[PDB]
Design a protein around this ligand. Sequence first.
Ligand SMILES: Nc1nc2c(ncn2[C@@H]2O[C@H](COP(=O)(O)OP(=O)(O)OP(=O)(O)O)[C@@H](O)[C@H]2O)c(=O)[nH]1
Ligand SMILES: Nc1nc2c(ncn2[C@@H]2O[C@H](COP(=O)(O)OP(=O)(O)O)[C@@H](O)[C@H]2O)c(=O)[nH]1
Ligand SMILES: Nc1nc2c(ncn2[C@@H]2O[C@H](COP(=O)(O)OP(=O)(O)O)[C@@H](O)[C@H]2O)c(=O)[nH]1
Ligand SMILES: [Mg+2]
Lengths: 54, 51, 50, 437, 50, 104, 39, 431, 431
Amino acid sequence: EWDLYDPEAKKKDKPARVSDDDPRCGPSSIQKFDGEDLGGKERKKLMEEQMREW
Amino acid sequence: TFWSHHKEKIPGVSQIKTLDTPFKKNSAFSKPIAEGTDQPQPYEQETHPFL
Amino acid sequence: IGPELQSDLETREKLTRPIVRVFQRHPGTNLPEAQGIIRGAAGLDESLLR
Amino acid sequence: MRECISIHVGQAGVQIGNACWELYCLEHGIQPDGQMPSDKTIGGGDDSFNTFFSETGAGKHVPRAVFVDLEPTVVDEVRTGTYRQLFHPEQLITGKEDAANNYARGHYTIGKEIVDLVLDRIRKLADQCTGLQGFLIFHSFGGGTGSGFASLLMERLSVDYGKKSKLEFAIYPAPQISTAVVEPYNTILTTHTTLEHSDCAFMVDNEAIYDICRRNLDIERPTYTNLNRLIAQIVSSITASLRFDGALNVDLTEFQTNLVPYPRIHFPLATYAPVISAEKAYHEQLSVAEITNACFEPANQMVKCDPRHGKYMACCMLYRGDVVPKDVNAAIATIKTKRTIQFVDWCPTGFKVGINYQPPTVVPGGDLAKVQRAVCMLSNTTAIAEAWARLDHKFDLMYAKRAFVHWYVGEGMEEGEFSEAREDLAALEKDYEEVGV
Amino acid sequence: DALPSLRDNCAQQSNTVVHQYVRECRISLVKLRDSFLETNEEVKSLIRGK
Amino acid sequence: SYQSIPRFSKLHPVIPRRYVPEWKNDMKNRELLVKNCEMSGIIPKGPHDESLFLDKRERMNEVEPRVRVEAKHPNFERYDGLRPEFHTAQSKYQSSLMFRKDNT
Amino acid sequence: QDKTMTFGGNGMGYTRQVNGNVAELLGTGASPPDAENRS
Amino acid sequence: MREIVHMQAGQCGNQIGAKFWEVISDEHGIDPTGTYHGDSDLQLERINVYYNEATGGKYVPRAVLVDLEPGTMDSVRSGPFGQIFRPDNFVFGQSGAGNNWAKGHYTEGAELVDSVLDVVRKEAESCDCLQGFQLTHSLGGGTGSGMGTLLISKIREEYPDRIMNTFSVVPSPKVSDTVVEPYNATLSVHQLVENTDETYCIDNEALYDICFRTLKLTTPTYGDLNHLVSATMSGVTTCLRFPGQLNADLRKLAVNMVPFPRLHFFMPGFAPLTSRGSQQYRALTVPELTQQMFDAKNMMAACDPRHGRYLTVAAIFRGRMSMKEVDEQMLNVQNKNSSYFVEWIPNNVKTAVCDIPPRGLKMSATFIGNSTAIQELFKRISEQFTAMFRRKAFLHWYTGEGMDEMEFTEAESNMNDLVSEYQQYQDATAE
Amino acid sequence: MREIVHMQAGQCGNQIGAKFWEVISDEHGIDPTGTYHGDSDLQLERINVYYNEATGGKYVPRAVLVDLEPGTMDSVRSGPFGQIFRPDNFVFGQSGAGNNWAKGHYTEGAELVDSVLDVVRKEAESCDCLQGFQLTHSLGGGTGSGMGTLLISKIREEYPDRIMNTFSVVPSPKVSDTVVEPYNATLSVHQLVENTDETYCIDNEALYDICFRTLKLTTPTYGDLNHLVSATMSGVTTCLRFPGQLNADLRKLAVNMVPFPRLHFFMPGFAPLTSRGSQQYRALTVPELTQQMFDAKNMMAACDPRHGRYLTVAAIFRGRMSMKEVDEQMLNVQNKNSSYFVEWIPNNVKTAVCDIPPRGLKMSATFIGNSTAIQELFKRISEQFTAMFRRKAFLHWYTGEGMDEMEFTEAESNMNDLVSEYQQYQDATAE
Ligand SMILES: Nc1nc2c(ncn2[C@@H]2O[C@H](COP(=O)(O)OP(=O)(O)OP(=O)(O)O)[C@@H](O)[C@H]2O)c(=O)[nH]1
Ligand SMILES: Nc1nc2c(ncn2[C@@H]2O[C@H](COP(=O)(O)OP(=O)(O)O)[C@@H](O)[C@H]2O)c(=O)[nH]1
Ligand SMILES: Nc1nc2c(ncn2[C@@H]2O[C@H](COP(=O)(O)OP(=O)(O)O)[C@@H](O)[C@H]2O)c(=O)[nH]1
Ligand SMILES: [Mg+2]
């Protein structure tokens, strides 16, 4: 039973997600949402460029 | 467009067999059989001229 | 009549400021805060029409 | 299978229809020859044009429209113009003798001889149709073909088709601008078929569109083409849910159900917000909050009536483009907390919002700026009764010493029609006041 | 005709009556509190007697 | 089994949407608050009609009678309202308060 | 000092001032000799 | 081999169900074609609970998609995980609903219900144990409310011994988005309370608030909403699909959570829900999951737990963990905030533990609460209903599609006395 | 396993707390990214007092960060040791009251106080045997005084027995930074008296002249003032955080300092203190530390202790050092300046000898005096308050905000009561 009941086992685990491209998190981890606008700033720059040129 | 870039993650988008814009409504799945023109259903191959 | 938007109404002027809220924490209560303003607004409106 | 039949009656209706079908063909990629250079569709995977056009075996896409007018001029102009190869020859029905700006002449003498032919053409179009949403009737209240013949056609359509949506787009006379003289008589006479036969009648006002084009589009000298293009933009924003994918899709029946409270109250104001000119779009954000506030601003309305002197019964906002429901709800909350917009007491709700993905298309050589965001508000309010008050004030002071009545009596109608129609419009004004109170 | 200070005047009416109510509640609270300490001391004495 | 028929006052755009007093909804001292309403006998404990402000109006129906809500007047007179003391925030209306004269 | 239009004060209290206002608004007062020396 | 038949009505219900089958296909390692591509046999034992065998190793979901608008049918067929569903259980009509409960119930919505019940009957007697029926929809439109309640009534008339859990997205007044949603909600709550014996009411404003505070989520849209709803959809039935230290299925939750028959509207929740900026500052511990379950802002039904008393609380945990730690946390919450708990029920918590976490996380949790604070949304719906029923607004549509005002009066009276029953059981002495 | 929850409010509070967390981090070996890189084993033993352990080697602080303007919030986040704080513990309003007790207490902060109590209750729940709460509020300003004392009142209702210490950055009569700081100080230390277990009040001009005279150093700015206050705050709890030869925590300090419930206002003092030029020419010994503690110029308050009687004096020593020298030095001090000690309290000095010295030095000492000469600070504050309030200057900003003059008068009256009680125990005799 020691594998999780170790007092220093909190120093051995990755938090939940680590980075933004972590393979283990998916649609069932309920932590990789599609709502974060990672490309939001690039999209805003593209919209500004399109509006200016038009 | 937000919806254009996050297309294929958007809830309501139907059967993008169109390249200039994706939001033209493809209603080939509904198509009750009295006026059906044998359109390609969203999970099968196309016809001669593939287009 | 107040300002033309409820966002810029300021916390010392809304009818449910925290002073009023800690008063309404007990039963009965019911400050006569809005009926007087309604009556004054109606009187001023009738003055404008006359 | 969703489809609509567009009936354009009168010179105003025909010209507005010309602009509308130009916008529709540009939106769906159909060139004015009538053939679709698809060139990007994979197979027959495009069903967006079904609601307006009928693809035939020659590669052509004939529109689902009927153009009728009693003088041959503008209809023959359409036959001699560019869209000759696009319109069906028998859809553009025309007469010989004009209706002479006369409701009696358009309803009892000249309108009784081609009503059978236009009803036959409508019958063929509806039999070709199989999922008909309804009829978009474009006309003017100025008088003649757009008043009398339109009234007779609407009566006949209500008798035969029955449970079908009939959305009316009516040119309304201005408070003080006018181009005719007997158009108060014509409007008073045609209040009935837009009151007891219509289902949702959007009035538009030439002064309001003139002021919009003078202040927002920077057009010092505008013609009717810009007005008709704006009306085309509005009707395209209305019908976009039937032909483009969207987050919330608002069809015609759902639109009417969420708009009209009572069968008598079916006259909502219409507002379109993208409105800025091309050079002035460089300086404005044109966000969701801005385009929602531009609709409720009492200067972009397309009827010359101030909505601050009234109560909003309901609003149907149709957002178009990169508009997200969180910004929609934030704009709705700001509008609801705003003091100026006053909603009626029996409607704690009142915002039917429908988000559509496909952003609007810009006409080549247009005046509207090409934008990413759009809103089209269709608001039922009690402030439209000011236009009727001005109208029947004009009618009363005309009809005091019986001016122009001899023409109508000679073309057949009785004098009691004026009294009955005046009393019906007075009842409508009292009904709107009673609803608002 | 109503004064052009009706909203502020009514708000400070509400503030004054809330202030009077909370001073009287403070008096009632300190009375209840010293009664509570008297009860607690008596309970301690009774426990020791037991 | 009885009739509710709620009644609301005139619209005023200072009313902040929907507001419920927290004495009806306090789940820490409710066993004292509700029995206080019972012992008073004029304050209804009923579950509905909690929002005395629903849209932009006040509830004239059973959230306390008009007696004891219209009686909270801290002795205000127009004679002392037209001449505000200098150290308070109401003295900046003196440019318009002296325009009114004084009769009653 | 200068009035300051506060509530009851110097006796009676919130409940007694409200009851007096109720009596005044509904009709005659409660009684003259009520609240002897404000108890 | 107990197994659940899923039904989904309306655009909202269809999109929630599509996200739900996406989530529980990731949980079993099933590609959208239908094959099993997982690694362990634990994802393959109880695959029959939601999926039915086809030829080869293909798994067709036991789901029925119903709508009166074909556009949403095309959208959910051609969207993500649209290939998993069978085209035969895509029964639809080509008319629409018009946000009309009368049109969805007493008109052409009742034309489609024959084929709908034929499909549901085919799936129901394609079973061997048939644990129950699980419906998702919204009480804001025509097909979601009217047709959904028609299926509820007919399925309960057919099989009145099966666990019927429906979720339903209730309308929030500060989201609006429809003008006749109080009419649609009042005419459907009557059928929900009378027939359905398990309801997990979900609110869009609560979902938006969760997205905007606990997840930042600069532009959440309708994807994240259905994603969280699917999380709580899987967390209530995880013990049927995976083994655990302390199992509890839908019937056990209904027994331990519903004290009286018309007392069954719940307040779902999920944990952990961590923002990207606070990802590295958080250590997943059982007390932390217990707190995020018992946080007010984490609720998914727009109620405030402090604004009422809990009757019963189901706590379903997932992952390897300690039963002592779980039990001490769920006892410590009762000992701490005992005022927000009814005193006539000792041990207001049902506790379930499953030792199979979701893919990704090592631990997760699911809250279900039969709180008496659920009455406030019903009161808001009732006050909007009487606001737009005072002047008989928008009734000509319903009378045209064949309803009288007496049905509206029944709906109002039933909602009023249901809220009064909540208040009476809430303000009850111990004995 | 005794825990302290730290709270910073206002610009000065956030800056002082940031410097405090910096010294705690490099005293316990915590690097800017929050990972233990220390050398001794006696640095991670008692670290749960101030740090909540996270996943990996992360150690977040148990602090609550409060403001009504985000400028100081962004400055603290962008500065060094800013990534250690949890992003949930950054509660800030948007308007900003600003030099206004009424706007900081009755409104603005009075709706943010619910979320701040949520965070404070969260940190208190995430503990075992919580020692209490320390605040670094900044009397004389806006959010620090009014909303800070509001937080003190609410957490005193919530947790009545846990030790409350504030650090009280009380204004000056001759610095003259704010025109309404007498109003704020008079109206807020009234709230401090009835609510705090103990206040370690620190002014600004004594920090100025300790830097100018004891340290010279010609550039303290605010950083070195925060360093001095921060060193004192570490010294008042080094016996709790580290093993020692004679331990004394905050409760022991409060019990041995206060003789009466409203005499809990302390004069702090840190006394290893020398310039760069006099660093090597100054022997570091226990008598030298005691001599620098019992010096009027080394006091962190404006109150000269020569005209005033000490009630109780605490010496928290840090280092490997001899009890015989410590006791002989306190006895020597009591024998020499016997006229500055009250006769009715014999042996009124407390020893608290720890083991681990602060980083860099080898011995240190923290002085906690409870002299009766502290009444003159409140005397000057009340003199300025009664100079302003006679003409009712700057009073509309409070009265139209929502207060009244009766609260000002009663605050002045209880200020005079506190001053009179300090004078009574200054003039009290033995028999
Ligand atoms: N916006 C807009 N209004 C038009 C246009 N053409 C005509 N109108 C309006 O129509 C009114 C007069 O009615 P007409 O349309 O000219 O006459 P009609 O409806 O064709 O009937 P007849 O008189 O028999 O020809 C005028 O007051 C104009 O405001 C147009 O192209 N655009
Ligand atoms: N949470 C959530 N709500 C939705 C979604 N789609 C629609 N809704 C809500 O459902 C309501 C309208 O219901 P609707 O889809 O028209 O029901 P239908 O007419 O039966 O299809 C709106 O108020 C939306 O807020 C979704 O994907 N997620
Ligand atoms: N010792 C010290 N005092 C400070 C510091 N920053 C500001 N102050 C003092 O704090 C007072 C202003 O308080 P402030 O922080 O503005 O309170 P707030 O308005 O609630 O944020 C001024 O008189 C300054 O002298 C600092 O870093 N150290
Ligand atoms: Mg013409």
